[PDB]
Design a protein around this ligand. Structure first.
Ligand SMILES: Nc1ncnc2c1ncn2[C@@H]1O[C@H](COP(=O)(O)OP(=O)(O)OP(O)(O)=S)[C@@H](O)[C@H]1O
Ligand SMILES: Nc1ncnc2c1ncn2[C@@H]1O[C@H](COP(=O)(O)OP(=O)(O)OP(O)(O)=S)[C@@H](O)[C@H]1O
Ligand SMILES: Nc1ncnc2c1ncn2[C@@H]1O[C@H](COP(=O)(O)OP(=O)(O)O)[C@@H](O)[C@H]1O
Ligand SMILES: [Mg+2]
Ligand SMILES: [Mg+2]
Lengths: 325, 261, 329, 131, 348, 261
DNA sequence: GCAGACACTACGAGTACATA
DNA sequence: TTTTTTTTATGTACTCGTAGTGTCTGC
């Protein structure tokens, strides 16, 4: 039936075959499940890569719908997970048998980096003592906020960023299941602006399809507000080729015409600053100045002065690069 | 349109005070047969199956079947200010969120209409096996509550055994062990105080004391409780209300590992 | 019959009255028809219309009688701790979607949680929103509104569809101001409206406030450029020329005199930074001097954004531009 | 020092409390206030004072009663009684290494305390006569 | 009563200076739909006088009958905090910075209860109430973020008049929601005219040279000018042209501190100067004013090619003082950096 | 000279408990007709009037129109030291800055004198318009106190509606709505339980909870209570305290939500 | 049948720390 | 060869003191 859902939740990989990228990790987890050798897992990686979807597909594969509420204990950062919960419901769930059917139980701890260190220290002997009865899956974005004692007990899988070559067919499946007219440059802009994230590629696809009705390069870069590659090349050419006043006028006209933001301009100019074969003394100064300009934009600071400083960081090094020869 | 009518308010107060520290939220399944509630606890160890009959209410009408999931702290605060001898009306519309509790003051003069907002949890149905048990014991509820309270002082996990002789409770704790065995207490003037053994095969299982003590809070609901045990199916505590329905408590055994030596 | 200020009298009641934010307005107008509304993250400069757009969308979607049952609006004026997110927001997201519109208009099958001013929420309270947004997405929607998207954590950035509210261009802002002045029976000259849309800098709330205050000051007669310059706090060009002449003099006593005269006249240091920046980028200085001076202007603006003293930052900026102007002499 | 500042501020009338913040009152209106409160007064009876001296004493007790400041007697281990302000704002104003200034004599401060007491009772009688 | 409070004007037509702004403020508040106001200017300019004149123009003469109201607010840490409030039958005056870092609890709890409720009598009072938030530049950004939706939701029944010294310490969301009213300091002629009118109403004679010296020494602060004029009247009734004007102790203590800095550049002298700076911070002097006085006295001893570097160091350590919490570290770092620069300049 | 005598010491011991957490000071206006107290709270939301006539005192001496300003924190502790059925004499000199309260000890052997400093507070009379209300109803005092107390556990702001049918209390929160009504209770033996309507125009106004709780803190002075409401006039809660005088409470409504169509 | 005494858990309050 | 005190803003965890309160004893 038709449902009113966001496309990041309407199109969720309910099975392990619907995830795209981490084929070796998913093959190893599938062979863990099929041989009943599932250990305590530690899924870590950047957001939007499919860790919660992986553990929910594994839990739906392991357990039927008539027994899913008694075998799976799913706790996350929206739940209270203090040390009284580790000593309370989690220990009682781990230390007791099942109700309906005999089997091993699963305690999913989503956002395990949000737990306090007291709870993580209390979890160690709960994990180690009841390995036969229950299994634990810790999922985090930052591995440093998990204590090394819990990192030793759980085998860790790095759910790295999704490569855009493998991100395309899932987006094509979502497009063909939603009747969306998309061009090749629209798909390329989607997998460029996503940057290893399938949430942001679905959100941007749904937002562009609602705003314009078609998904092309211009529509995606207009709905997102991101500058194009040609605009960044023009900004760099103006900052390296002419004086302060003409470059300031041209960049100000380009920003007023297309409604660009200085954060995305700074990000793309930072990406361009390493491809350009600059001297090493020039690159250090440019990176320090651009990091300072990016830091100044985090508060109530006028963006026009920061645009002038972004021009100034290159107008300083123009004559240095030229006289270097 | 759902409209039930409790003839007295005491039984609903006892039910919602029995489940207050145990049940996270109440899922009233409504049909023409009666009111059903199958809900697990917050630890996913216990299970509560309450079945209230349509003949026990004053008036009961149910056009279409409903499944009303509601919070329990709010309903506990509503039922705290309810009398024990007043008629309490539960109302619910077809496509609305307001579950209405209408009752009277303890001064019995003014009316009170408390609405509740229904929750939208999608809960998969838990399959009760309804199989035969290897041990069925009919015993008084007050003696069961007393023996659970007396074993709570000794340990935390209790080994309850049952055989042809009778039920037996053990608590191997820090002070020491306490082993209490009861049998054939039917030779009294009362009919509620009696221990009857029906089934054959002896079973020994270890359970937590906190959940047993939460289960014993339904002592005023039934004078006689039933204990069902087997080697695979969990512990069932059955309270048979007089003319309203019944209440089943399911508690899973704990994981006990023998010594390697 | 009480009077009301024009910022609330001309708040957009519907989504058709929101100006210049064409992509998010088109998304919300598609969601009014019945399209799948995603989670929203509005971010941009102040006065661009982030709160008014989502309130107009909620009023169009639910009507008057369902605003209290389908919209939970939490802002920084109330307590939003970890327990408010764990208890209040999660229990609102777990509620049923009941209640229908009595005027026969269609109603969407979800609730809306407007977490306005999400910059002030902590990282733990933002981390507690993640599975609340994902798990309860069938029955509620979330709209985080902020000014800086860097202060919202990357899981909440990923979970929401990001819309940046651009500053309003001079065409759309001038058209909206002329429509408001036409509806209020006040007359404003072309130089006055040009200086008004120059001064307001894409802040439509500031433009409406300045237009209302200029109407109240003049009594309903013609609004010229002089009242706009008076009420806008714009430093005259004579003071800027005196500051630049004091810097070209090379003596620090005249520099201290002009800085103290600008401080004692109560001029805001941000306005002085803006006008000095315009003069510096619009003269015949060398590229190195302009580069150093604009870098010092950016640093001074950052320091003033952190609540530093105006007099010391202005005297440091004036010392820097005095050194640059006396280097070539 | 903050407790002393709040104790000084809470004694002033609320009509004059709103006209200045305690920060501006501390920075601007404390040392000059103490210079106002300490004029050149001879140790002589008000009877022998000139009409101008009586008007100056009336102004002095008026601005003393406006800020709820008064002199009371303080004991010393050396055996000498002294007169000191009951809100001791001199430690709020004065600094250790700053050049010395002439303080008021014992007779002048006792005269100021007696004048502020008879001015308070005369104000009470005048308020009784008005009401 | 002092001369600062005896001859304060009561209405907008009785202001000696900024008369055009007085007429504009009378025309602004006549209709009653005026927005929130942000009165900003230097200290002693006459901001609070103009705010009270705006309140008189709005309501009756009952705004001069004020009273102290005490409120107890519960923090999220469950610490009861007492806050005083100047109140009348028409308006309230709150200074939330007295709650310090808990000032947000004043904005979230105490202010909104004022905003969410309409008035008792709508005939003697007008259709709206006024809240005067005094010294909003000392508010934390959490309180200023709590202020904005209260200012936007209930602005038809509660108008607000924020008062500050510098608008740079006010966040742009708050400055976007209110009309900014600039009250500049009066000039030397305006202060001389005010002092002459005060002396004429007191029945005295004031020379023009003495009034010019008072306006010069007050640094365009009319409150300090009136206090200095009354102190000069007290200490010597015949007004001589070269009469010695009394001075504040913390200013001359700052001058002696900077003389001690410039006299010797040693770690022992640095430890003595650190003791002097604790003495200054002990007496509740704000550290930015200590930094400004130190710069203003140390620039009189530097050469022409060092003043820019000294001013840049003063601004840098002032900004680092604002970013931090212990003022003595950044003050002593500024003094040590100036000592190093001064020793390098004098030995070379 | 101000010299007043009470016939019963329980009047102050039931009228100062409501004003302990409501208003910060007590300003007594001395006149030939009686004593008047009009005080507004620190939030400018609530207003308290108390008019006790001169005929209700045992004796009353008044030659000049005077006003005394006392604090509440010291007077509340002074009141608790006094008895219940003893007599209380209030004395105030023309020239002194203090108020004396003389009563009998609870041991009934000695006379107790307590003196309070008169605070010089500069206030003005706000002045009620005394306009015709769109709804006037009469309620029992203790029933109204129980009604305001029952909605305290539900929400922080209550809604009072008054049509021709009766008076409806509502409390909508995160839990749910609690709606109670009172109508046509004239068929009782007691004259104080007659819930009656007296005007025509229906009103619906939202008020705070804490101020109504502080208003219901002064219940047992009068047998009945009177509620007055209109479209913009504040809620007026009136007690006719025996024969000496009357007490009025004014509560401003809340700002209504943006419920435009 | 009702007043006094017993331990019982829920709740209010004060304090510390948070890293490698 | 040398020792006192409360601010930082939440969130969690620990520890301890206090107060309704269910239940048992007795005349
Ligand atoms: N590998 C993937 N294959 C298909 N869809 C994906 C994949 N990764 C992410 N998605 C989409 O993103 C949604 C949410 O992914 P999540 O399971 O939350 O990823 P995650 O990496 O666990 O995110 P965090 O780290 O918890 S914010 C899914 O329901 C899909 O719509
Ligand atoms: N795009 C717009 N179209 C029409 N009116 C607008 C627009 N933007 C702002 N306004 C007007 O300015 C007022 C302020 O708009 P808001 O929506 O509160 O701005 P904002 O986005 O909330 O700014 P911040 O970030 O919260 S300070 C509105 O009430 C309108 O009167
Ligand atoms: N127009 C005026 N005429 C005479 N005196 C004035 C005038 N304006 C202000 N003053 C005096 O100058 C002082 C300025 O203080 P205040 O009004 O609090 O302004 P601020 O808040 O800027 O210090 C007041 O004490 C007042 O008496
Ligand atoms: Mg996830
Ligand atoms: Mg907003």
């Amino acid at each position: 039936k038709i449902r009113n859902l966001p496309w990041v939740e309407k199109y969720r990989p309910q099975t392990l075959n619907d995830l795209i990228s981490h084929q070796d990790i998913l093959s190893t987890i599938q062979k863990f499940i099929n041989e009943d050798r599932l250990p305590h897992l530690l899924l870590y990686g950047p957001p939007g890569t499919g860790k919660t979807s992986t553990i929910l597909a594994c839990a739906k594969q392991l357990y039927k719908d008539k027994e899913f509420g008694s075998m799976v204990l799913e706790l996350n950062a929206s739940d209270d997970r203090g040390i009284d919960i580790i000593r309370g419901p989690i220990l009682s769930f781990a230390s007791t048998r099942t109700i309906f059917k005999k089997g091993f139980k699963l305690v999913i701890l989503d956002e395990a980096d949000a737990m306090t260190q007291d709870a993580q220290n209390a979890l160690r002997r709960v994990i180690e003592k009841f390995t036969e009865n229950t299994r634990f899956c810790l999922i985090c974005n930052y591995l440093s906020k998990i204590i090394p004692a819990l990192q030793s007990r759980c085998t860790r899988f790095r759910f790295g960023p999704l490569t855009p070559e493998l991100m395309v067919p899932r987006l094509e499946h979502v497009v063909e299941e939603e009747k969306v007219d998309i061009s090749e440059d629209g798909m390329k802009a989607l997998v460029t602006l996503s940057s290893g994230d399938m949430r942001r590629a679905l959100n941007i696809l749904q937002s562009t399809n609602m705003a314009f009705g078609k998904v092309t390069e211009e529509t995606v870069y207009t709905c997102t507000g991101h500058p194009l590659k040609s605009d960044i090349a023009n900004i760099l050419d103006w900052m390296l080729n002419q004086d302060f006043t003409t470059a300031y006028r041209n960049i100000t006209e380009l920003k007023t015409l297309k409604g660009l933001a200085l954060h995305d301009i700074l990000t793309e100019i930072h990406l361009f600053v390493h491809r350009v074969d600059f001297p090493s003394s020039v690159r250090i100064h440019l990176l320090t100045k651009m990091a300072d300009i990016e830091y100044r934009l985090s508060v109530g600071t006028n963006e026009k002065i920061q645009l002038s400083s972004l021009i100034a960081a290159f107008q300083v090094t123009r004559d240095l690069i030229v006289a270097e020869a | 349109m759902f409209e039930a009518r409790l003839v007295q308010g005491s039984i609903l107060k006892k039910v919602l005070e029995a489940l207050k520290d145990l049940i996270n939220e109440a899922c009233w399944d409504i049909s023409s047969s009666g009111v059903n509630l199958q809900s697990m606890d917050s630890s996913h160890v216990s299970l509560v199956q309450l079945t209230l009959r349509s003949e026990g209410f004053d008036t009961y009408r149910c056009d279409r079947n409903l499944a009303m999931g509601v919070n329990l702290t709010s309903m506990s605060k509503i039922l705290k200010c309810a009398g024990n001898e007043d008629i309490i009306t539960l109302r619910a519309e077809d496509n609305a969120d307001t579950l209405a509790l209408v009752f009277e003051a303890p001064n019995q003069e003014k009316v009170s209409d408390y609405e509740m907002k229904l929750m939208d949890l999608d809960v998969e149905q838990l399959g009760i096996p309804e199989q035969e048990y290897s041990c069925v014991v009919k015993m008084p509820s007050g003696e069961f509550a007393r023996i659970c309270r007396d074993l709570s002082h000794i340990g935390d996990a209790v080994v309850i055994s049952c055989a042809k002789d009778g039920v037996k409770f053990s608590a191997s704790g820090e002070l020491g062990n306490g082993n209490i065995k009861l049998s054939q207490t039917s030779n009294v003037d009362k009919e509620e105080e009696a221990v009857t053994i029906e089934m054959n095969e002896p079973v020994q299982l270890t359970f937590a004391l906190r959940y047993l003590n939460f289960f014993t809070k339904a002592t005023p609901l039934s004078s006689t409780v039933t204990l069902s045990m087997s080697a695979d199916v969990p512990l069932v505590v059955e309270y048979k209300i007089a003319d309203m329905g019944h209440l089943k408590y399911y508690l899973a055994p704990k994981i006990e590992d023998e010594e390697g030596s | 019959a009480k009077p009301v200020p024009w910022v609330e009298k001309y708040r957009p009641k519907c989504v058709d009255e929101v100006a210049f934010q064409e992509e998010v307005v088109a998304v919300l107008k598609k969601s009014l028809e019945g399209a799948d509304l995603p989670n929203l993250l509005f971010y941009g400069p102040p006065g661009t219309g982030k709160t008014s757009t989502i309130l107009a969308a909620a009023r169009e979607l639910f009507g008057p009688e369902l605003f209290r049952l389908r919209v939970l609006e939490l802002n920084a004026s109330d307590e939003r701790g970890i327990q408010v997110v764990r208890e209040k927001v999660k229990n609102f997201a777990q509620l049923t979607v009941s209640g229908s519109r009595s005027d026969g208009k269609p109603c969407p099958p979800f609730k809306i949680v407007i977490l306005d001013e999400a910059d002030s929420m902590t990282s733990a309270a933002q981390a507690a929103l993640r599975r609340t947004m994902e798990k309860e997405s069938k029955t509620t929607r979330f709209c985080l509104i902020c000014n800086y998207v860097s202060r919202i954590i990357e899981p909440l950035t990923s979970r929401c569809s990001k819309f940046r509210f651009k500053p309003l261009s001079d065409k759309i802002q001038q058209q909206r101001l002329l429509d408001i002045a036409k509806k209020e029976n006040v007359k404003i000259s072309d130089e006055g409206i040009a200086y008004l849309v120059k001064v307001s800098e894409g802040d439509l709330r500031k433009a409406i406030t300045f237009l209302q205050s200029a109407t109240r000051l003049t009594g309903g007669k013609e609004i010229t450029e002089k009242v706009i310059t008076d009420i806008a706090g714009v430093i005259p060009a004579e003071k800027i020329d005196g500051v630049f002449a004091a810097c070209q003099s090379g003596s620090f006593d005249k520099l201290e005199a002009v800085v103290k005269d600008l401080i004692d006249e109560g001029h805001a240091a941000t306005q002085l930074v803006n006008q000095l920046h315009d003069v510096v980028v619009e003269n015949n200085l060398s590229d190195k001097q302009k580069s150093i001076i604009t870098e010092k202007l950016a640093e001074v603006d950052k320091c003033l954004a952190d609540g530093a003293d105006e007099h010391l930052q202005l005297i440091s900026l004036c010392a820097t531009v005095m050194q640059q102007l006396s280097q070539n002499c | 020092m903050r407790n002393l500042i709040q104790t000084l501020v809470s004694g002033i009338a609320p009509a004059t409390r709103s006209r200045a913040t305690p920060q501006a009152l501390l920075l601007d209106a404390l040392c000059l206030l103490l210079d106002i409160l300490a004029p050149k007064l001879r140790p002589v009876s008000t009877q022998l004072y000139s009409t101008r001296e009586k008007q100056q004493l009336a102004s002095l007790v008026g601005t003393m009663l406006a800020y709820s400041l008064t002199y009371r007697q303080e004991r010393t281990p050396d055996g000498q009684y002294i007169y000191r302000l009951e809100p001791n704002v001199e430690e709020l104003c004065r600094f250790p290494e700053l050049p010395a200034r002439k303080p008021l004599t014992y007779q002048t401060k006792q005269l100021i305390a007696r004048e502020i007491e008879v001015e308070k009772m005369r104000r009470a009688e005048a308020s009784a006569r008005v009401e | 009563s002092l001369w600062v409070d005896k001859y304060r004007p009561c209405s907008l037509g009785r202001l000696d200076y900024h008369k055009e702004q007085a007429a504009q403020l009378r025309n602004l508040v006549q209709c009653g739909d005026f927005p929130h106001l942000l009165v900003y200017g230097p200290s002693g300019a006459g901001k609070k006088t103009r705010i009270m004149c705006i309140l008189r123009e709005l309501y009756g003469v009952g705004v001069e009958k004020l009273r102290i109201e005490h409120q107890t607010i519960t923090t999220p840490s469950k610490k009861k905090i007492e806050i005083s409030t100047i109140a009348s039958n028409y308006h309230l005056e709150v200074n939330p910075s007295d709650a310090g870092n808990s000032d947000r609890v004043v904005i979230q709890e105490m202010l909104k209860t004022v905003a969410q409720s309409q008035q008792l009598e709508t005939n003697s009072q007008r259709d709206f109430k006024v809240v005067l938030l005094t010294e909003v530049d000392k508010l934390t950004k959490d309180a200023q973020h709590a202020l904005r939706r209260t200012m936007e939701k209930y602005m038809s029944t509660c108008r607000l008049i924020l008062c500050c010294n510098s608008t740079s310490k006010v966040i742009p969301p708050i400055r976007s929601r209110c009309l900014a009213v600039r009250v500049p300091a009066p000039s030397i002629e305006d202060i001389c005219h005010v002092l002459s009118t005060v002396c004429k109403k007191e029945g005295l004679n004031l020379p023009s040279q003495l009034a010019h010296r008072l306006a010069e020494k007050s640094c365009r602060n009319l409150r300090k000018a009136l206090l200095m004029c009354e102190a000069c009247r007290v200490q010597q009734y015949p007004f001589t042209a070269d009469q010695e004007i009394p001075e504040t102790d913390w200013e001359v203590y700052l001058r002696e501190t900077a003389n001690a800095i410039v006299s010797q550049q040693t770690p022992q002298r640095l430890l003595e100067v650190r003791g002097r700076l604790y003495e200054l911070l002990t007496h509740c002097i704000p550290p930015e004013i200590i930094m400004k006085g130190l710069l203003s006295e140390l620039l009189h001893n530097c050469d022409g090619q060092l003043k820019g570097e000294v001013a840049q160091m003063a601004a840098y350590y002032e900004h680092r003082l604002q970013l931090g919490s212990k003022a003595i570290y950044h003050l002593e770092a500024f003094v040590a950096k100036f000592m190093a620069l001064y020793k390098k300049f004098m030995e070379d």
